Paper text:
Crenactins, restricted to Crenarchaea, are more closely related to actin than bacterial MreB. The exact biological function of crenactins is currently unknown, however they were found to be located in functional clusters with other genes, including SMC proteins (Structural Maintenance of Chromosomes), highlighting possible roles in DNA dynamics, for example.
The best conditions yielded crystals that belong to space group P41212 with a very long c-axis and diffract to 3.2 Å only, with the additional complication that diffraction is fairly anisotropic perpendicular to the long axis. This enabled automatic model building and manual rebuilding and refinement, using 2-fold non-crystallographic symmetry, to produce a high confidence structure, refined at 3.2 Å resolution with good R-factors and geometry. The structure of crenactin shows several loops that are longer than in actin, but overall, crenactin is closely related to eukaryotic actin, with an RMSD of 1.6 Å. This is most pronounced in loops 295–322, which corresponds to a loop in actin that is involved in the formation of double helical filaments and has also been termed the ‘hydrophobic plug’. The crystals of crenactin have a very long c axis because they contain essentially infinite helical protofilaments. Eight subunits form a complete turn of 360° over a distance of 419 Å, the length of the unit cell of the crystals. This means that each subunit repeat is 52.4 Å and the angle from subunit to subunit is 45°. The crenactin crystals contain a protofilament, made out of a single strand of crenactin subunits and this leads to an overall protofilament thickness of only 70 Å.
Author numbering:
A (entry chain A), B (entry chain B): 5 to 430
């Protein structure tokens, strides 16, 4: 069937923090935290308050559903599982797999269908470029099981940045995509150029980790130790320099211009003091650069530090650059194609979503800008030739891609373990 | 008709790398690679990107049409096809003929005609001397078919080096003509003296493969593995010695005068180091004389080797000299005739296109010179009496050759099977 294919195509982007899902039909994707809450470490008179089915699996998942069992916990550090801390789930790590399985279930679960025609979903799934083969068969297995519980006609799985490309509708480009734990920057010429893939071991999270170590310095060590806390602080105070060293001065001589405060809870309000307005920039710049003495100051001894990690063959570089990285990405393609591929730089993901506060264009930069700056800094030659833009709706990009890709990808194509594309059926 | 014949005569040189094509009217022929892209192994939302018409044949050709589907598949070995790798298409090799047909169509396709009078092209085709009878019947069959899609009045097929004779307008001469895969050297006295035909089994391609192995030694193994890169390197750094050992010693003792760097893509730039500037000469000299311990060093163990191949009756000699081959050619004609056939040495093909870097005539040599030199080396006798020149525009010679030949070659002359000359009509 076909018209069918415009109602009943189902898209599911994973990655780190949220999991965007929903039918081809939504104007936007629903959005769900990428964590599970485990049920063992818990008082009993609230285990009865829990339906017997949900008690079955040691797992609860949901934006509101986990929201409201958070206060009565024993080990919130042991009982809260984040698989895909790094876009990748540790091969054998069982809880991590289980979370994903319920994450997979929950999402499908939100859209039951009354239509008598419905004869299954067409599920498309977006995983990190970083994602190894075992992880594909894993995700394949999950959806395989879940067709006992729901009508699933077919399932496939393209990479995340590929989806952005399909989503943008740009055949040739380099796609740099930052989410929570890392930025995968990946060149596309109709498919993922897998040797040109660079990953950075730093994402939306160092932006928190700098926020968190700033709040302690202002003197809010209370709020600091709560993640939900630092997120909205950072999301709301965070700034990106045009050049940082120039920005710092501009705010040290005119604090007033840059001071801010934001209400977290009707009771709570965080003000960034005249004393510290200038750290607002370390929040933003650290996605893009981490090479300034001022950012080096909080890695001195302070909390979760900046380093390289290794997943597949691939090494996510702790320090490098978005710039140095997009170049290194380019040097790793066919000499033939570097022209048409450096043509088009597309920024997607949460971690690039920064805005300039009205009246601050002076020295604050949005990410498209911060990046172009970085290129002219590095290669006036390239920069000139390059068109860098950011997607509208950075979170939902990888989604829209997944859904178009799921739409037309004809049903005759079977998944051939090694072609790395095509439908599976159960 | 006649003024007709100056508008609508169509020229088609084949051979190994490029196919020069175009109406008699163009100052230069169009140029198009002698390969095809086979469509089975591909991304499917990117064959939605192809005409279903061109999805018809498993084949695309086009200098740009192939260019932009090249990143869609890594290790292009099997998905890319060069028929006439050696100037001949392997007899039954089905895909090689398949390419040829679409190559044949493509070329014609580029010149649509609006004129009411047009009632057919007058097509002339250049093939290697080397080209067996089946291949003439085959190429004849091709154009026979496409006359259903295009207005084709008549067709005929002359040898490559004979076209150069006609193009040069030299009744009596030896034509040495070199492309990618081989140099054919063939004596002309109104006709091509078929017993005088010698082929060298090496062309502009060894100058690449010396480049390729030179590149690895400098330490650019990445770049070396792409054809498009090596070509551009070769073409840009390659040198022809006056005498090689005299040239090496000249660049070992003064590297600076011989170092060079060259921009491949706005990112990559390949420098030939102070250390190796002398290998630039191995690029040049290899077309002409693969007999030096230095060139023998890379045949030692290294990649695609220098050997004898065997086509029709003819053996393409791996190791021989353009000078020794020129002699041997001569020794196979009428003793009566050797005088004014050796009178005139004509140099054609891209493979001879070498230029000397301003201020290097000192020790570097263009191919006219390098050959002349090789003759006074071998027959001081011969040399003196001989005038050796290079065509201007060596790429496009064979082509003007074919158009003049197709121009005046009376239409009453039918293509007989054994006379090996005349028109077919379809
Ligand atoms: N304005 C903003 N500036 C910087 N980062 C942001 C902003 N808004 C949201 N984020 C980041 O969004 C991230 C989560 O987004 P998401 O697209 O789900 O990435 P992933 O799927 O890799 O977890 C968090 O790192 C948070 O830091
Ligand atoms: N400057 C140059 N020096 C030497 N060879 C060149 C140069 N430019 C192009 N070529 C050569 O042109 C050759 C192809 O010539 P072509 O006339 O198409 O022969 P064929 O048709 O037999 O392939 C390639 O070997 C390439 O090396």
């Amino acid at each position: 069937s076909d018209a069918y294919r415009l109602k009943y195509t189902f898209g599911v982007d994973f990655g780190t923090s949220y999991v965007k899902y929903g039918p081809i039909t939504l104007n936007e994707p629903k959005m769900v935290q990428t964590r599970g809450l485990f049920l063992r470490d818990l008082p009993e008179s609230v285990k009865m308050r829990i339906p017997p089915d949900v008690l079955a699996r040691g797992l609860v998942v949901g934006d509101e559903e986990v929201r409201k069992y958070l206060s009565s916990v024993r080990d919130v550090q042991r009982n809260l599982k984040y698989p895909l801390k790094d876009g990748v789930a540790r091969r054998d790590d069982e809880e991590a797999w289980r979370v994903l399985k319920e994450l997979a279930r929950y999402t499908l679960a939100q859209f039951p269908v009354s239509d008598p025609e419905f004869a299954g979903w067409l599920v498309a799934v977006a995983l990190s470029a970083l994602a190894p083969d075992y992880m594909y068969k894993a995700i394949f297995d999950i959806y395989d099981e879940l067709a006992s519980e729901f009508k699933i006609y077919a399932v496939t799985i393209l990479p995340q940045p590929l989806a952005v490309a399909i989503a943008e509708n740009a055949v040739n480009c380099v796609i740099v995509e930052g989410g929570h734990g890392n930025i995968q920057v990946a060149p596309i010429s109709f498919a993922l150029i897998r040797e040109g893939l660079v990953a950075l071991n730093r994402g939306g999270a160092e932006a928190n980790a700098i926020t968190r170590e700033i709040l302690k310095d202002i003197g809010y060590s209370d709020i600091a130790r709560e993640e939900y806390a630092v997120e909205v602080v950072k999301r709301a105070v965070g700034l990106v320099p045009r050049r940082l060293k120039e920005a710092i001065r501009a705010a040290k001589s005119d604090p007033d211009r840059f001071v801010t405060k934001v209400r977290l809870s009707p009771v709570v309000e965080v003000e960034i003091p005249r004393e510290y307005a200038w750290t607002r920039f370390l929040i933003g710049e650290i996605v893009f650069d981490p090479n300034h003495e001022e950012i080096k100051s909080y890695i001195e001894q302070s909390r979760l530090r900046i380093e390289n990690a290794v997943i597949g063959d691939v090494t996510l570089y702790g320090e490098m650059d978005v710039a140095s990285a997009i170049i290194t990405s380019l040097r790793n393609v066919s000499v033939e194609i570097q022209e048409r591929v450096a043509s088009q730089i597309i920024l997607s993901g949460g971690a690039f979503s920064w805005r300039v506060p009205p009246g601050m264009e002076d020295v604050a930069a949005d990410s498209v800008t911060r990046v172009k700056i970085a290129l002219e800094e590095k290669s006036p030659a390239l920069a000139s030739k390059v068109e860098v833009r950011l997607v509208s709706e950075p979170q939902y990009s990888v989604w829209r891609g997944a859904v178009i890709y799921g739409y037309a990808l004809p049903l005759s194509l079977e998944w051939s373990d090694t072609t790395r594309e095509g439908w599976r059926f159960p």
